[PDB]
PDB file of C-alpha atoms (C1' of nucleotides) and ligand atoms in Angstrom:
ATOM      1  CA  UNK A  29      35.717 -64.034 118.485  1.00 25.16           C
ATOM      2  CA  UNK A  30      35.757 -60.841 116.609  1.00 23.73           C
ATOM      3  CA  UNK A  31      35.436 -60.855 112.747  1.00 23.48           C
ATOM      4  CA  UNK A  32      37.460 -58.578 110.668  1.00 21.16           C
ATOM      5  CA  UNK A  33      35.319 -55.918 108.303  1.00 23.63           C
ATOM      6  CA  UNK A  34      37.154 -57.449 105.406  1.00 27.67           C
ATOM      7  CA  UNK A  35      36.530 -60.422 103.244  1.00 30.97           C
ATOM      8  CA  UNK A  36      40.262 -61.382 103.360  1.00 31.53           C
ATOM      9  CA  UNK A  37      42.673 -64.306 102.081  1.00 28.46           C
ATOM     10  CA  UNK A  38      44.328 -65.888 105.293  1.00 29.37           C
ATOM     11  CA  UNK A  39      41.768 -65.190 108.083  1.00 26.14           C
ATOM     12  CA  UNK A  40      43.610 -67.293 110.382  1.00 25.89           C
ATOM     13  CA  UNK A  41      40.209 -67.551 112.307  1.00 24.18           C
ATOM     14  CA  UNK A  42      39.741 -71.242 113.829  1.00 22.45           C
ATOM     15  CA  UNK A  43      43.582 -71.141 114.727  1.00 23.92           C
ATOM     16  CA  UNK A  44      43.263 -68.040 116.748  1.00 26.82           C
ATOM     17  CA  UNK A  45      42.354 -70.376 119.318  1.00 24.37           C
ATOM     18  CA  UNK A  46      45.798 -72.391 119.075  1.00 27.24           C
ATOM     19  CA  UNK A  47      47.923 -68.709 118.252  1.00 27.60           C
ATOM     20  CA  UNK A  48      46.406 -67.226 121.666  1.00 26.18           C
ATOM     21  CA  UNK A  49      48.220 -70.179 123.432  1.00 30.05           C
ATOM     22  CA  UNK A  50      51.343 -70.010 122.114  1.00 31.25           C
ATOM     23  CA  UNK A  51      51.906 -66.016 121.635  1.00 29.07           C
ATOM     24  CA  UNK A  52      53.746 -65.231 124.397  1.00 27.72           C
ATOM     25  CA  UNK A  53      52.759 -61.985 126.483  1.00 29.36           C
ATOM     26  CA  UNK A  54      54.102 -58.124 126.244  1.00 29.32           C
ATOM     27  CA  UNK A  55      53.774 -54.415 125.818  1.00 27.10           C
ATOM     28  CA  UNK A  56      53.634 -54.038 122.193  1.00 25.89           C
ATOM     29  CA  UNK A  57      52.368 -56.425 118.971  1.00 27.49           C
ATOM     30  CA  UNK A  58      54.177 -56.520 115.533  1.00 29.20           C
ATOM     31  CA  UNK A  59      52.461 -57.928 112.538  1.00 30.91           C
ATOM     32  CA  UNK A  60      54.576 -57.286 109.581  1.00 33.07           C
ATOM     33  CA  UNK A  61      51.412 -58.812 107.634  1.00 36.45           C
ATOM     34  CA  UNK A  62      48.033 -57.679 109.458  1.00 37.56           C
ATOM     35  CA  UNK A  63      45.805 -58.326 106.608  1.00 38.62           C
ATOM     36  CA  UNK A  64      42.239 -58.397 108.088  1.00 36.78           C
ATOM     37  CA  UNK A  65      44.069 -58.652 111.597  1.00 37.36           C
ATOM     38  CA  UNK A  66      42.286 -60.980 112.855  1.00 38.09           C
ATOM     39  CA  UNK A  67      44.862 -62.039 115.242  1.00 37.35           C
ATOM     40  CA  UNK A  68      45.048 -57.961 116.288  1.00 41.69           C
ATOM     41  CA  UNK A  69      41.327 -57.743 116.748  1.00 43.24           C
ATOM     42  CA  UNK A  70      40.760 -61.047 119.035  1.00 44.90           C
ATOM     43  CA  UNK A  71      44.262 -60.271 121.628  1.00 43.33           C
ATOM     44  CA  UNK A  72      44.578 -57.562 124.022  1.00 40.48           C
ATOM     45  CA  UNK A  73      48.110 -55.681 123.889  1.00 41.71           C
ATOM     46  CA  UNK A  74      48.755 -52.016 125.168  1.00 39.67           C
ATOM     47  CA  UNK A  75      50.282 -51.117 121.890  1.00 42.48           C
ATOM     48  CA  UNK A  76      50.239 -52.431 117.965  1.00 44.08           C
ATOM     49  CA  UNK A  77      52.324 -51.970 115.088  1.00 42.56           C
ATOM     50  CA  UNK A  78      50.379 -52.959 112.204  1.00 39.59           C
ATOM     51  CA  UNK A  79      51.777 -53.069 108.237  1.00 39.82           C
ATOM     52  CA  UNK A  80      51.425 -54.753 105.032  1.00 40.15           C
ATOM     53  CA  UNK A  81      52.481 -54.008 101.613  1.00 40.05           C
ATOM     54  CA  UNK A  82      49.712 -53.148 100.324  1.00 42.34           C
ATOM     55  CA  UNK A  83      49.424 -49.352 100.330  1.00 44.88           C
ATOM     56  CA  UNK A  84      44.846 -49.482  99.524  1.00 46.95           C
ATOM     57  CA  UNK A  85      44.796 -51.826 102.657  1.00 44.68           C
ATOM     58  CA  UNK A  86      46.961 -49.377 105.020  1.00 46.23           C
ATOM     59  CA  UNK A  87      45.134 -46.479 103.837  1.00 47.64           C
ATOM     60  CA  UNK A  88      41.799 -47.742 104.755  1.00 51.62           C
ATOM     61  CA  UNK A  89      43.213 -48.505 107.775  1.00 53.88           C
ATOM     62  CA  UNK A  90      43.932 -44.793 108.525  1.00 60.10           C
ATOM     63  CA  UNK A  91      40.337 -43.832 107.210  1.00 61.10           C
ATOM     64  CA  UNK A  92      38.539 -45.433 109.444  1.00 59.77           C
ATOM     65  CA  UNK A  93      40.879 -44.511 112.719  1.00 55.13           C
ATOM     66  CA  UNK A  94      41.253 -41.571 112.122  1.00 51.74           C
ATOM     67  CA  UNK A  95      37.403 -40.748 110.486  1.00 51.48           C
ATOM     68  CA  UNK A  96      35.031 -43.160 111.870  1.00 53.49           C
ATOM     69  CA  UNK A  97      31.909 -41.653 111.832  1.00 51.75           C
ATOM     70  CA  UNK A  98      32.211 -39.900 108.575  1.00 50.39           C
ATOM     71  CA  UNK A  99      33.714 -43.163 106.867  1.00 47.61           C
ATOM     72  CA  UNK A 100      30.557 -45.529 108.143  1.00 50.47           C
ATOM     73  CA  UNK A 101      28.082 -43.167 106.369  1.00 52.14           C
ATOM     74  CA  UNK A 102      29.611 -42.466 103.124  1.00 52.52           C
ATOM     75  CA  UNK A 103      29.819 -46.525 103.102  1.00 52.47           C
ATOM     76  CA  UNK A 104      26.991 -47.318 104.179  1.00 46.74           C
ATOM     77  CA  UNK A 105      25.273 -45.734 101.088  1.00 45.73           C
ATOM     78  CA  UNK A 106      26.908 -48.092  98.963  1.00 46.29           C
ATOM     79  CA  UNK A 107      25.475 -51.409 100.966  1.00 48.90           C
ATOM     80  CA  UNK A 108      21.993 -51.317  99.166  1.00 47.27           C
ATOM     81  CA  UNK A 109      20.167 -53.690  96.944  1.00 46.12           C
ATOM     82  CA  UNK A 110      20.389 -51.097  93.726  1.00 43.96           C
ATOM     83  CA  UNK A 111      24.139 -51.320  93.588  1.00 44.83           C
ATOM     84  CA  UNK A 112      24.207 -55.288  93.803  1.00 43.31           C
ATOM     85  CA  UNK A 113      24.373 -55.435  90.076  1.00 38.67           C
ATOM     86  CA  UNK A 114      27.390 -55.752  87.331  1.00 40.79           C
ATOM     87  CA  UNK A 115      26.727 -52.481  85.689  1.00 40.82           C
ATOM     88  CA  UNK A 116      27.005 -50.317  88.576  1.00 46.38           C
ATOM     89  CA  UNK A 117      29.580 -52.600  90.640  1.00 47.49           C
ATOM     90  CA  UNK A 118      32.322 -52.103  87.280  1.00 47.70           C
ATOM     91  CA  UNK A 119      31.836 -48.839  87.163  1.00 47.75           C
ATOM     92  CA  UNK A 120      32.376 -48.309  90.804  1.00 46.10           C
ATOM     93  CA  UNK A 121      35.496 -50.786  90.444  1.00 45.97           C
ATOM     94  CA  UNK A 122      36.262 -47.913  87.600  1.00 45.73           C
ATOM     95  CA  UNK A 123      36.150 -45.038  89.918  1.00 43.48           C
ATOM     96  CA  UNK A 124      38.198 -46.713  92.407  1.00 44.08           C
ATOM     97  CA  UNK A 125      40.865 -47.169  90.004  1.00 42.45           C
ATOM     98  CA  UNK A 126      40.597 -43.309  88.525  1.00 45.28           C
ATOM     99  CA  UNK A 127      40.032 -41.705  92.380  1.00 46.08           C
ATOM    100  CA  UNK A 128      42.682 -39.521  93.599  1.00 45.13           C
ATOM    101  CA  UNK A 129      40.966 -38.894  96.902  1.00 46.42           C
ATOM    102  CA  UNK A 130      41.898 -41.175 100.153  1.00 49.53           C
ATOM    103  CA  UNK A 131      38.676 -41.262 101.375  1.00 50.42           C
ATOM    104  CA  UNK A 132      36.507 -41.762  98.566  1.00 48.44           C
ATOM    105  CA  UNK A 133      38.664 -45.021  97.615  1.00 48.50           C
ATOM    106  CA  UNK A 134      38.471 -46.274 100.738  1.00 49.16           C
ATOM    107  CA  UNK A 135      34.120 -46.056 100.584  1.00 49.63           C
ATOM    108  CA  UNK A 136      34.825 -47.927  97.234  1.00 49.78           C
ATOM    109  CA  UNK A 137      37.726 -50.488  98.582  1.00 49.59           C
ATOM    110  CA  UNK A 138      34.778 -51.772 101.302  1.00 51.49           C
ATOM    111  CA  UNK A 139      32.719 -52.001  98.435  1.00 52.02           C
ATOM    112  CA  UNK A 140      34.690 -53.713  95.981  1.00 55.30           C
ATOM    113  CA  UNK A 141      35.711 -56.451  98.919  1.00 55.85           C
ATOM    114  CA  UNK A 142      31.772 -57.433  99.773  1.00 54.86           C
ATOM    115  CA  UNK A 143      30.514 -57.085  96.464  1.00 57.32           C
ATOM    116  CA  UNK A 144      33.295 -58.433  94.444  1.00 54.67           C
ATOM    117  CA  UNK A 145      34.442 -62.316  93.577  1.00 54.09           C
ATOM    118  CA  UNK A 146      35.197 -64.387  96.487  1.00 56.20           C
ATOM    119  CA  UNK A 147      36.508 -61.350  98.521  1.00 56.55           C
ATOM    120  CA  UNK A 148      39.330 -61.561  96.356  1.00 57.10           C
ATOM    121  CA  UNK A 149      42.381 -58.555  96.258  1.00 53.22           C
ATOM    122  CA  UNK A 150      43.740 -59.115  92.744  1.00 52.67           C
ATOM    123  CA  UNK A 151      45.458 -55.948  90.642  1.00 53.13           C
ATOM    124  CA  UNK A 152      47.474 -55.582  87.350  1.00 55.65           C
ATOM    125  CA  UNK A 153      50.631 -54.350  86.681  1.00 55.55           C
ATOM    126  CA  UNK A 154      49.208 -50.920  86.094  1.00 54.34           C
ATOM    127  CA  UNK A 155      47.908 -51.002  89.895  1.00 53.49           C
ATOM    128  CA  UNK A 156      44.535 -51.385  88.794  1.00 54.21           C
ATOM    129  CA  UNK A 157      41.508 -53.412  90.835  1.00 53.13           C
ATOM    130  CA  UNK A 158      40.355 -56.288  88.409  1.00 50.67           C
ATOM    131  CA  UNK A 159      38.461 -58.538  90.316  1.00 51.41           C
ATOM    132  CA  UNK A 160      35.072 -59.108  88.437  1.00 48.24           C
ATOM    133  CA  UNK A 161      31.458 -59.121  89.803  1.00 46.79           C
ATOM    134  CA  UNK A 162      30.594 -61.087  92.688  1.00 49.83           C
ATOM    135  CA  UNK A 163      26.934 -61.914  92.664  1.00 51.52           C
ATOM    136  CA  UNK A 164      25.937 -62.682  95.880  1.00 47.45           C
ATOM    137  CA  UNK A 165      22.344 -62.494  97.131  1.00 43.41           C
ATOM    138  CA  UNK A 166      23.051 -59.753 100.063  1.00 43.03           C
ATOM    139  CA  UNK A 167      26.193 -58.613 100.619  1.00 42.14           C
ATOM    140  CA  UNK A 168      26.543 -57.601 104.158  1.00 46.65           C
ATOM    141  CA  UNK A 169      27.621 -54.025 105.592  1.00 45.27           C
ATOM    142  CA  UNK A 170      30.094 -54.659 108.632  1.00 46.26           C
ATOM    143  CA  UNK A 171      28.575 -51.639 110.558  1.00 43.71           C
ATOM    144  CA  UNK A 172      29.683 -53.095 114.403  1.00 42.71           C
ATOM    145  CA  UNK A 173      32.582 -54.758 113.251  1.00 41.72           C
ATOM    146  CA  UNK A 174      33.755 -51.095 111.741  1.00 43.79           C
ATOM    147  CA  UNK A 175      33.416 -49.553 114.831  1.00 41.60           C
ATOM    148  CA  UNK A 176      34.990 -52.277 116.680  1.00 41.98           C
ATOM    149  CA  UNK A 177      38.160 -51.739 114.365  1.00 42.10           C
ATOM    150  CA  UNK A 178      38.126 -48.387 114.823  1.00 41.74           C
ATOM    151  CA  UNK A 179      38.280 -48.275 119.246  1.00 40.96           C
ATOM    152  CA  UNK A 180      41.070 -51.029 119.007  1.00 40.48           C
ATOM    153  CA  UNK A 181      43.153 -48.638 116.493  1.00 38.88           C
ATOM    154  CA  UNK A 182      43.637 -46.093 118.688  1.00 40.84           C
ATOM    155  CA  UNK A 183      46.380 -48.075 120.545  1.00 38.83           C
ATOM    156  CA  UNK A 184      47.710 -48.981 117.287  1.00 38.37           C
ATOM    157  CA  UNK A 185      50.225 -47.405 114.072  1.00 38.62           C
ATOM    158  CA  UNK A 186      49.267 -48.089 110.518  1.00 35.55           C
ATOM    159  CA  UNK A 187      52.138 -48.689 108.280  1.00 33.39           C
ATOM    160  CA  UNK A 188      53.225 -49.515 104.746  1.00 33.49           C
ATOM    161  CA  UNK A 189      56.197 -51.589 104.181  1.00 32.05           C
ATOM    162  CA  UNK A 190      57.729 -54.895 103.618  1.00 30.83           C
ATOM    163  CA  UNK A 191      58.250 -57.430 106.448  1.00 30.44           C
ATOM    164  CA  UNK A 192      61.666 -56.725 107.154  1.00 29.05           C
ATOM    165  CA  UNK A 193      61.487 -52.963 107.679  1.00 31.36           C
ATOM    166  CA  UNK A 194      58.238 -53.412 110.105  1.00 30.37           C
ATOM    167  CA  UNK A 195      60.031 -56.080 111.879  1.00 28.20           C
ATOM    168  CA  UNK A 196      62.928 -53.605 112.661  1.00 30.46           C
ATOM    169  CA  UNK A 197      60.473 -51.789 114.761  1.00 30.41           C
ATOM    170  CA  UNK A 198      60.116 -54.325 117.313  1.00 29.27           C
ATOM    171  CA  UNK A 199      61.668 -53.849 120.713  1.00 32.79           C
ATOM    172  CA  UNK A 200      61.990 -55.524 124.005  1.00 30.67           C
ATOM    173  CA  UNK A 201      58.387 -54.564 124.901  1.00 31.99           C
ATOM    174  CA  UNK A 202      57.417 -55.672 121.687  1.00 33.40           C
ATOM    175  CA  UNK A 203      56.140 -59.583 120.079  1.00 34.26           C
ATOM    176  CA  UNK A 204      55.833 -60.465 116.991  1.00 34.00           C
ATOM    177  CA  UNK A 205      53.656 -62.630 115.231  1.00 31.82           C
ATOM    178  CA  UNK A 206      54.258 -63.296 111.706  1.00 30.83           C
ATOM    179  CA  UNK A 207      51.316 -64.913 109.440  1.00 29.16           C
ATOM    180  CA  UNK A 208      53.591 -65.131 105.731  1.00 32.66           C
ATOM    181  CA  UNK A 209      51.466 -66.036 102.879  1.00 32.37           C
ATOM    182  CA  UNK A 210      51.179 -69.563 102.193  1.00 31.22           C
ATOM    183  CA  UNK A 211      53.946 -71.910 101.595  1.00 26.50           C
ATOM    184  CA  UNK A 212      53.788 -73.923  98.506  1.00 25.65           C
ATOM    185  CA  UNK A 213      52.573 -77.203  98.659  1.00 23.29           C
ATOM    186  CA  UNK A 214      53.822 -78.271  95.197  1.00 22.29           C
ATOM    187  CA  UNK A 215      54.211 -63.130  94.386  1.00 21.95           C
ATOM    188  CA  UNK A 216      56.321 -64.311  97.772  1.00 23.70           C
ATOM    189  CA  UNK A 217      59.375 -66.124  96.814  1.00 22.92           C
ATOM    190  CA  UNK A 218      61.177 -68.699  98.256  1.00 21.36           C
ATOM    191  CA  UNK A 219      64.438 -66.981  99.617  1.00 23.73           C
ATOM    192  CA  UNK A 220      61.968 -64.342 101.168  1.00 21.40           C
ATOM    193  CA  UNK A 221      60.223 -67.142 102.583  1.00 22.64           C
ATOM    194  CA  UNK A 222      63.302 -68.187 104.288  1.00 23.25           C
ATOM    195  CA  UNK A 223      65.069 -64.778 105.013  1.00 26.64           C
ATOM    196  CA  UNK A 224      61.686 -64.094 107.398  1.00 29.09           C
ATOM    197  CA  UNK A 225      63.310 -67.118 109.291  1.00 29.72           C
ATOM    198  CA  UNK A 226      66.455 -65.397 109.185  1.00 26.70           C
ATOM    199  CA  UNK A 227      65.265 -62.303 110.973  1.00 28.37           C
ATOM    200  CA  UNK A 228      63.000 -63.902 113.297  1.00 27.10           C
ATOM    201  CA  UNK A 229      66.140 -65.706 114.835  1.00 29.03           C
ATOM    202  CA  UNK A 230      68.130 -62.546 114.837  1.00 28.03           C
ATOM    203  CA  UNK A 231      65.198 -60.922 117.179  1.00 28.92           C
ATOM    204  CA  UNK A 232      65.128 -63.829 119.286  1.00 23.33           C
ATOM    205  CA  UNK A 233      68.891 -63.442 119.730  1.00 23.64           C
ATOM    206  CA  UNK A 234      67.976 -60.005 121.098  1.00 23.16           C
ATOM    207  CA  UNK A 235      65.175 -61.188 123.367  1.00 23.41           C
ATOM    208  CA  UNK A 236      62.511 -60.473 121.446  1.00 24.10           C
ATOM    209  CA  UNK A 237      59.755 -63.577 121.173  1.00 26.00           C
ATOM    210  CA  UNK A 238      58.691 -64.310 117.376  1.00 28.93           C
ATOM    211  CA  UNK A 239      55.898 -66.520 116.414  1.00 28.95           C
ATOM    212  CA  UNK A 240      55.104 -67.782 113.199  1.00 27.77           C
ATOM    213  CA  UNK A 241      52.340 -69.209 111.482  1.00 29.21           C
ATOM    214  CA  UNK A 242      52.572 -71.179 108.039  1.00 29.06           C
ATOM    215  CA  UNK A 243      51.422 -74.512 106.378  1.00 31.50           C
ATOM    216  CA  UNK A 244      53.046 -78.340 107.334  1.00 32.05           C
ATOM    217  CA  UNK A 245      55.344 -78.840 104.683  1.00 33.55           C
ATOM    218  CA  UNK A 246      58.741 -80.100 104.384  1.00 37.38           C
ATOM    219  CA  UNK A 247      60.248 -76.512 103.239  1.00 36.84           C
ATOM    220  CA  UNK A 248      58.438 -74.899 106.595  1.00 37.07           C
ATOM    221  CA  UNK A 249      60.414 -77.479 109.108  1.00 36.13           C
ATOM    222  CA  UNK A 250      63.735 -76.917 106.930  1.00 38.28           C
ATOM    223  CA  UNK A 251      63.257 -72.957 107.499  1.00 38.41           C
ATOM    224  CA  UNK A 252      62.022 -73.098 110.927  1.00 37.23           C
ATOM    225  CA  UNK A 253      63.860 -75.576 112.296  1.00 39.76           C
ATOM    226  CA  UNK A 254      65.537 -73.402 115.294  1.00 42.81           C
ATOM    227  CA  UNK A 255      61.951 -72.618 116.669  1.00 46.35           C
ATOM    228  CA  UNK A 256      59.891 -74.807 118.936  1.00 45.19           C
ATOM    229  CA  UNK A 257      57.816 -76.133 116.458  1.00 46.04           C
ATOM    230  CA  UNK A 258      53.898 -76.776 117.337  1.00 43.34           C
ATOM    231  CA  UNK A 259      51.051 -78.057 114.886  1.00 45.20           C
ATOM    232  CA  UNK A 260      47.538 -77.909 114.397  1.00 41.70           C
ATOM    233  CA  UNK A 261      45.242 -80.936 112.896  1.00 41.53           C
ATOM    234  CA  UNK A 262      43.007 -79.148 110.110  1.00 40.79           C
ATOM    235  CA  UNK A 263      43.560 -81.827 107.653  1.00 39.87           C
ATOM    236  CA  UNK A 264      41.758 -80.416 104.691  1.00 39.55           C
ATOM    237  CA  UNK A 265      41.664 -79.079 101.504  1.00 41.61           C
ATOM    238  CA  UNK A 266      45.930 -84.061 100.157  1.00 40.72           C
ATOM    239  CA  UNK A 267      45.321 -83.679 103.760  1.00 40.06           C
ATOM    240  CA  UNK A 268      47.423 -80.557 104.712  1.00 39.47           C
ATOM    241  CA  UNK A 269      48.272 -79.124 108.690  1.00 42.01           C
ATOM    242  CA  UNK A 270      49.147 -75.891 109.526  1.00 40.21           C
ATOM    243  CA  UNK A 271      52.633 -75.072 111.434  1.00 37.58           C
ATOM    244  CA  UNK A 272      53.615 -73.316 114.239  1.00 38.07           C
ATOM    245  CA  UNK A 273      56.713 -71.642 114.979  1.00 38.85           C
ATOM    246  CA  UNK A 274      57.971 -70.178 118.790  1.00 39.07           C
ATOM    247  CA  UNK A 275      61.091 -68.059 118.816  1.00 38.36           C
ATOM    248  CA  UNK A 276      61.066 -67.648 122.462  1.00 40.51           C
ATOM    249  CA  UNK A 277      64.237 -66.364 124.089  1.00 37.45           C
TER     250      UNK A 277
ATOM    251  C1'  DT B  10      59.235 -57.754  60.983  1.00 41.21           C
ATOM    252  C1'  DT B  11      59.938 -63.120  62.204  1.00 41.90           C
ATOM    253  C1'  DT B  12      59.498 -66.619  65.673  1.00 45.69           C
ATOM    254  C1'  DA B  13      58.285 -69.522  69.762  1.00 43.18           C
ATOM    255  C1'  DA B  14      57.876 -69.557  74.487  1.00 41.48           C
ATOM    256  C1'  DA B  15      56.343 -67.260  78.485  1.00 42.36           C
ATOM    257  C1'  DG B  16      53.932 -63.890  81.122  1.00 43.04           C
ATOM    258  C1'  DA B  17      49.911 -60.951  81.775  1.00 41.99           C
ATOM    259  C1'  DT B  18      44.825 -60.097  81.564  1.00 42.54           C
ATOM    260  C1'  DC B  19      40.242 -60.665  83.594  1.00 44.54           C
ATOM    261  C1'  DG B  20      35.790 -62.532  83.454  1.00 46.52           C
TER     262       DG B  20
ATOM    263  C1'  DA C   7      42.714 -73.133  89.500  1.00 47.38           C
ATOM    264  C1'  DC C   8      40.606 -71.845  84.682  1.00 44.20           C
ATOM    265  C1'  DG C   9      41.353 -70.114  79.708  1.00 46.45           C
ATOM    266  C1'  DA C  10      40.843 -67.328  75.457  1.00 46.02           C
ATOM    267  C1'  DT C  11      43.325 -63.270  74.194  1.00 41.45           C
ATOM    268  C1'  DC C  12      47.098 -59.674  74.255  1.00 39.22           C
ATOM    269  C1'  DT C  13      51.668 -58.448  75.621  1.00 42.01           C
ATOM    270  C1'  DT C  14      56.448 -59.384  76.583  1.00 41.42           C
ATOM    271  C1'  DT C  15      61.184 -61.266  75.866  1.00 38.77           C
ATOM    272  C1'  DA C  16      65.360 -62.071  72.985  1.00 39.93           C
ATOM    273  C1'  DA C  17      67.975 -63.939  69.084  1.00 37.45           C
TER     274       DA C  17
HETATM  275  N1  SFG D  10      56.753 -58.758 101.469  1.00 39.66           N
HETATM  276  C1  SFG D  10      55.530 -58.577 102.191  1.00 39.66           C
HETATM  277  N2  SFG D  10      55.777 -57.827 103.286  1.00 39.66           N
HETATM  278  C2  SFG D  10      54.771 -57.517 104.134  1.00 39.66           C
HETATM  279  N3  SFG D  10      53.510 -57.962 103.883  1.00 39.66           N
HETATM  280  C3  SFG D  10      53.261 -58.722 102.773  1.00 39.66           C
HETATM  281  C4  SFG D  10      54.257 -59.028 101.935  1.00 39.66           C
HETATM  282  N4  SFG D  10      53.742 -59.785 100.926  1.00 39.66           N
HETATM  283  C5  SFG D  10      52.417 -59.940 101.154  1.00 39.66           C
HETATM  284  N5  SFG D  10      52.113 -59.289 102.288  1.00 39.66           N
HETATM  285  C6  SFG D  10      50.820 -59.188 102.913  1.00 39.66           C
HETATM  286  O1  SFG D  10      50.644 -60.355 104.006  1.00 39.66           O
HETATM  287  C7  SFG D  10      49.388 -60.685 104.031  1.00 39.66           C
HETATM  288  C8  SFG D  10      49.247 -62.227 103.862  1.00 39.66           C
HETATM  289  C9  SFG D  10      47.935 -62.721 104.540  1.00 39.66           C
HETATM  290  N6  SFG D  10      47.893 -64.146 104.509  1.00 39.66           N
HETATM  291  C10 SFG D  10      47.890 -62.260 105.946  1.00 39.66           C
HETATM  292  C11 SFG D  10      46.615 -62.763 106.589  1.00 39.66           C
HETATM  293  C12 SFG D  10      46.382 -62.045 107.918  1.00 39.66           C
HETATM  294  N7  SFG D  10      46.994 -62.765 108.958  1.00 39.66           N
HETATM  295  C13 SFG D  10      44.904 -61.955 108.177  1.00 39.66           C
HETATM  296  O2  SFG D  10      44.439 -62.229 109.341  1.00 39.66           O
HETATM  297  O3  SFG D  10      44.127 -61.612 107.255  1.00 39.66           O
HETATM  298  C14 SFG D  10      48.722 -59.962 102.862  1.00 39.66           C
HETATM  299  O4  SFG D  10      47.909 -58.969 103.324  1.00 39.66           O
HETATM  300  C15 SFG D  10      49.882 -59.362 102.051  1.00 39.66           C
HETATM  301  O5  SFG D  10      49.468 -58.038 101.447  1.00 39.66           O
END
DNA sequence: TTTAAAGATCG
DNA sequence: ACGATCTTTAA
């Protein structure tokens, strides 16, 4: 099993075990919402198409593909015990939020994951990082797992864009494996919720597999009811499952 | 400016 | 999820 770099809501890392089984094999991987890509680092496809709407996350992304060696020591600097404080973490949350410079936010976005609250991604309307101090005894610098990332990337494109554009890139080479943030139990809406349904059956129609990941509620059965649906006893956190859902053609 | 509810902010 | 404090929305 192969941990992401980032500190990242959704990690999706005890069901990789149950997702392996039921992703169905191909040329090329679609992930309209990579995240950490957890799923991406522990499979083994000849191609990926990675995305996600957030533009910070993409951009690292590209960083450390495309400048590896250059990235891990300019972040590296930042992992020591003299920056584990509030003083100089806020003021390196400030720079972030003033850079212009690619690179130099994407030293300070490894930062600001590790050292900030709970690993959190939380901005205001202005675009602006607010996630407050962290505190944590040691935070730890993801040296292997960076360069791990970084040899799997090659076979893979880095793009940012909503779920339905991304998923428009899939072909008949290509699955898809879609991991939606959370459904309700009691921002992603509700109709957007249900219109990834809509596309995922109008991919299948092509012969293109889809698979889907989500909680065990009764909105997730009513969207994904033309799938073959599959679940997974977590029971934690009321006692709530997590859903499966197999578009295969 | 008034007003009351709602959203946004950020530790 | 929390909550004290601004900001927003519209008659
Ligand atoms: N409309 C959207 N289109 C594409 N991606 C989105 C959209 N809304 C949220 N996301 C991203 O989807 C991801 C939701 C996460 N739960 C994904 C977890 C991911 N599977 C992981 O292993 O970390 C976040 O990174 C979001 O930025």
């Amino acid at each position: 099993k192969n941990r992401a770099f980032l500190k990242w809501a959704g990690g999706k890392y005890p069901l990789l075990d149950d997702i392996k089984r039921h992703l169905p094999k191909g040329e090329c991987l679609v992930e309209p919402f990579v995240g950490a890509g957890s799923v991406f680092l522990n499979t083994d496809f000849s191609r990926y198409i990675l995305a996600d709407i957030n533009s910070d996350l993409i951009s690292l992304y590209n960083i450390v593909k495309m400048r590896t060696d250059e990235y891990v020591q300019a972040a590296r600097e930042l992992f020591v015990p003299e920056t584990n404080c509030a003083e100089v973490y806020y003021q390196f949350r400030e720079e972030f939020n003033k850079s212009q410079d690619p690179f130099r936010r994407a030293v300070l976005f490894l930062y600001l994951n590790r050292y900030g609250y709970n690993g959190l991604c939380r901005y205001n309307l202005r675009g602006e990082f607010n996630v407050p101090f962290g505190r944590y005894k040691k935070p730890y610098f993801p040296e292997a797992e960076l360069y791990h990332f970084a040899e799997k990337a090659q076979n893979a494109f880095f793009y940012c864009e909503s779920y339905a554009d991304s998923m428009a890139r899939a072909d008949d080479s290509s699955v898809v494996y879609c991991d939606p943030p959370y459904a309700p139990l009691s921002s992603f809406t509700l109709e957007q919720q249900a219109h990834l349904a809509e596309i995922a059956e109008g991919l299948v129609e092509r012969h293109i597999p889809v698979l889907i990941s989500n909680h065990d509620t009764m909105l997730t059965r009513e969207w994904y009811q033309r799938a073959k649906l599959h679940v997974v006893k977590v029971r934690r956190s009321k006692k709530v499952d997590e859903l499966l859902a197999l578009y295969k053609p």
